[PDB]
């Protein structure tokens, strides 16, 4: 079949080494390794077949090599095909499918990446203009579907377990604390919070390593809020321990936290697990030998299994996660590092015969990571929210007004006070808790 001349329609120039490379050692479709932006637009709207995975990967990751205004111009230019019997086939096997693919790209763009249009009103204007000029019959159903989407964007099965209570009674907000709430319910309510925080993070906050740059507060607000929650719970656990100066009471505190970890494990809240593991690895807590001495061996083993998830670059964490099925809450840190090193450890552009080609497979690699993040965001936990426990943890503020350094220095100095360095003898401290320290355990009530 015959096409127009690349002097009137730029997407007709033929493939070459200066145009498109394919991956050599890997659903019937070739995997594009690199190509000019023209060639990338061409295969994004290919006439021979549709390529849903290329369209998904592309729209998730294009902003590093092409601006949104430029992409819209390019797909409009791909749409407006000039002509060269022969025509009748051309219309049916080139213009028709190529134009349907353009409309498919617009549909997916408006549907899954509408933030491009929220952050540039003129981009949404050009899109509506373009869609308005589309006048065909094979088009009509696509033109109306895109317009419905645009208009919209401009605006359990079984029952969950009974909520568990320990010393604090429902509604007695003022008595909520680490030892008075039920350990099972602490873990559950923290899992609900952390699950929602995990589910709110969008790929727009991750592609381009944008959470590490000076506008991170603007571009990754949900990711940062999630991390700051995790950090807060770690620091809260450390503070509960070292501010409990009586040894027997501190053993009760450390022991209860380990029971919270066990339930975290039961629920596949790996963010929860790591909150606890990080707290036990911290300088103020790790050195408290007299406290771990009294921890019963069964809880030691629970904490040991949890900590070992993090050893050898998370080897066991990664296996354990691959083997569970939703709902879970993954630890996000690994994803951040892998996305960052992928973007920083691979060239933005490959050179072939002096010609510059966008390195797309590096973008594929990053979309694979954001894809794995989304697959764990689908399924929610079958657990009931407790409005008040939830607010208790939403408002935890262990640091108060102190700065990081001042506060972690204070935690460490508390550690040294309650168990001084080995020469000095171990002092005694008066109890601070009026209620009984015995734990209800982690098996539910019925």
């Amino acid at each position: 079949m015959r096409l127009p001349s690349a002097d009137v329609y730029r997407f007709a120039e033929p493939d070459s080494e200066e145009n498109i490379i394919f991956e050599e050692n890997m659903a019937g479709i070739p995997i594009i390794k690199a190509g000019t932006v023209i060639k990338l637009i061409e295969r994004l709207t290919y006439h021979m077949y549709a390529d849903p995975n290329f369209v998904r990967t592309f729209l998730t990751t294009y902003r590093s090599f092409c601006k949104p205004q430029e992409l819209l111009s390019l797909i409009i230019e791909r749409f407006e095909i000039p002509e060269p019997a022969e025509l009748k086939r051309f219309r049916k096997e080139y213009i028709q499918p190529v134009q349907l693919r353009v409309l498919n790209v617009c549909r997916h763009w408006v549907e899954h990446h509408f933030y491009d249009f929220e952050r540039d009103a003129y981009l949404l204007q050009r899109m509506e203009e373009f869609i308005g000029t589309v006048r065909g019959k094979a088009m009509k159903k696509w033109v109306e579907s895109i317009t419905k989407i645009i208009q919209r964007k401009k605006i359990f099965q079984s029952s969950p377990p009974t909520v568990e209570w320990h010393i604090s009674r429902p509604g007695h907000i003022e008595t909520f604390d680490l030892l008075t709430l039920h350990p099972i319910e602490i873990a559950r309510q923290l899992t609900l919070l952390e699950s929602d925080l995990y589910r709110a993070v969008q790929p727009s906050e991750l592609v381009g390593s944008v959470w590490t740059k000076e506008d991170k507060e603007i571009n990754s607000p949900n990711l940062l809020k999630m991390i700051r929650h995790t950090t807060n719970l770690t620091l809260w656990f450390e503070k509960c321990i070292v501010e409990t100066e009586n040894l027997e009471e501190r053993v009760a505190v450390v022991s209860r936290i380990i029971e919270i970890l066990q339930v975290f494990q039961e629920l596949n809240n790996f963010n929860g697990v790591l909150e606890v593991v990080s707290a036990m690895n911290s300088s103020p807590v790790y050195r408290l030998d007299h406290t771990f001495e009294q921890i019963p061996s069964r809880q030691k083993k629970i904490l040991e299994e949890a900590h070992e998830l993090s050893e050898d670059h998370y080897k066991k964490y990664l296996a354990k996660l691959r083997s569970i099925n939703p709902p879970c809450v993954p630890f996000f840190g690994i994803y951040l590092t892998n996305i960052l090193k992928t973007e920083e450890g691979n060239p933005e552009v490959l050179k072939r015969h002096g010609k510059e080609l966008i390195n797309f497979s590096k973008r594929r690699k990053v979309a694979e990571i954001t894809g794995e993040i989304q697959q764990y965001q689908n399924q929610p936990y079958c657990l009931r929210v407790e409005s008040d426990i939830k607010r208790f943890f939403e408002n935890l503020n262990p640091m108060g007004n102190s700065m990081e350094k001042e506060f972690t220095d204070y935690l460490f100095n508390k550690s040294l006070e309650i168990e001084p360095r080995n020469p000095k003898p171990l002092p005694r401290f008066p109890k601070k808790y009026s209620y009984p320290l015995k734990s209800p355990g982690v098996r539910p009530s019925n």
Binding site: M280, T291, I295, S297, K301, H307
Partner: peptide, 9 residues
Amino acid sequence: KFHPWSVAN
């Protein structure tokens, strides 16, 4: 030795 939550040999 080997972390405070480990079985001490």
